[PDB]
Design a protein around this ligand. Structure first.
Ligand SMILES: O[C@@H]1[C@@H](O)[C@H](O[C@@H]2CO[C@@H](O)[C@H](O)[C@H]2O)OC[C@H]1O
Ligand SMILES: O[C@@H]1[C@@H](O)[C@H](O[C@@H]2CO[C@@H](O)[C@H](O)[C@H]2O)OC[C@H]1O
Ligand SMILES: O[C@@H]1[C@@H](O)[C@H](O)OC[C@H]1O
Ligand SMILES: O[C@@H]1[C@@H](O)[C@H](O)OC[C@H]1O
Length: 302
């Protein structure tokens, strides 16, 4: 645990939170629980709420890991971001084997409804749809798009809002780090069109999985993302190859510059536990000590 809390400091700047991804296996080992307790104010289940973990068989739900995280979060007063409802990855084979429009639609709705009602009122935001865009801005051809068509997105969001009107509904994606990139512009145009049609998209989530030097691009990309008109936008799965303080400060400043940016979520605590460990992209090293990037963010926020 570090002496200065980036979450407390970001709160003093007028933002809602600075959080991290985690799960039961992380919370019960290392110094993870201590660091999240003292330095962060929000958590996102890294894997316990995905489709493969929660509904391995149709109608046969498993909330073990998910229940653990929510309970731990409430007890410690940490905000929660549900992650993630509709995604083509980590999807049970029984889902992708469905070729009937009606069936897949009801199945997708049942999945969304069940997960969201179980935690009704306890989740700040949900990543309803994850990675729905191709790099060129076109909609990714997944089983949902193929079987249901474009309407699967409006349906998912409409169903989510019905399940828990208290949560902020987000569409989440990566590679939205440059204002000139086609994907970035496309999501802004698509969200604008959807909202104009009454689809309840409260926020755009920007994963922000960066490589060295890409932090500078976010200074322009976030404001562009914000121009879609959504109530909120957020940095949802931040990590930077090399963990340079320059890149990290740039992403934080980008959020401080955009009024609709509610907060930032870093994808993990310690480097070795990162899904990109080989690039030591996190704010804490293997010894669970804060890295220069952590101290630079703190100095920047104070
Ligand atoms: O639309 C709302 C924004 O007006 C709000 O903006 C915050 C206001 O306080 C400032 O200190 C913060 O920097 C800024 O983000 O954010 C929430 C949103 O709902
Ligand atoms: O522990 C790993 C997770 O960190 C990883 O999380 C995904 C990373 O890519 C993002 O686009 C997704 O939103 C996020 O869920 O998933 C694999 C797991 O092994
Ligand atoms: O069961 C939990 C699992 O769902 C999560 O993905 O990782 C931690 C485990 O304890
Ligand atoms: O698998 C995806 C990966 O390609 C991207 O870089 O980050 C998000 C992940 O979901």
């Amino acid at each position: 645990q570090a002496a200065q809390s980036v979450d407390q400091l970001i709160k003093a700047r007028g933002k809602v939170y600075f959080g991290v991804a985690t799960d039961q296996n992380r919370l019960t080992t290392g110094k993870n629980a201590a660091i999240i307790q003292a330095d962060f104010g929000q958590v996102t289940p890294e894997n316990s709420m995905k489709w493969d973990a929660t509904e391995p068989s149709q109608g046969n739900f498993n909330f073990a890991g998910a229940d653990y995280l929510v309970n731990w979060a409430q007890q410690n007063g940490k905000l929660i971001r549900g992650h993630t409802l509709v995604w083509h990855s980590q999807l049970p084979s029984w889902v992708s084997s469905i070729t009937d429009k009606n069936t897949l639609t009801n199945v997708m709705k049942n999945h969304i409804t069940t997960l969201m009602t179980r935690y009704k009122g306890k989740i700040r935001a949900w990543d309803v749809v994850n990675e729905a865009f191709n790099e060129d801005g076109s909609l990714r051809q997944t089983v949902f798009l193929n079987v249901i068509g474009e309407d699967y997105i409006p349906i998912a969001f409409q169903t989510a809002r019905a399940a828990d009107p208290n949560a902020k509904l987000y569409i989440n994606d990566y590679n939205l780090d440059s204002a000139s990139y086609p994907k970035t512009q496309a999501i802004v145009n698509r969200v604008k069109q959807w909202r104009a049609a009454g689809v309840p998209i409260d926020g755009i989530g920007s994963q922000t999985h960066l490589s060295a030097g890409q932090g500078a691009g976010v200074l322009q990309a976030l404001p562009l993302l914000a121009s879609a008109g959504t109530p909120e936008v957020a940095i949802t799965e931040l990590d930077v190859a090399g963990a340079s303080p320059t890149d990290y400060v740039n992403v934080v400043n980008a959020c401080l510059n955009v009024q609709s940016c509610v907060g930032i979520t870093v994808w993990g605590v310690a480097d070795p536990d990162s899904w990109r460990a080989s690039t030591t992209p996190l704010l804490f090293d293997g010894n669970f000590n804060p890295k220069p990037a952590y101290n630079a963010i703190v100095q920047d926020l104070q």
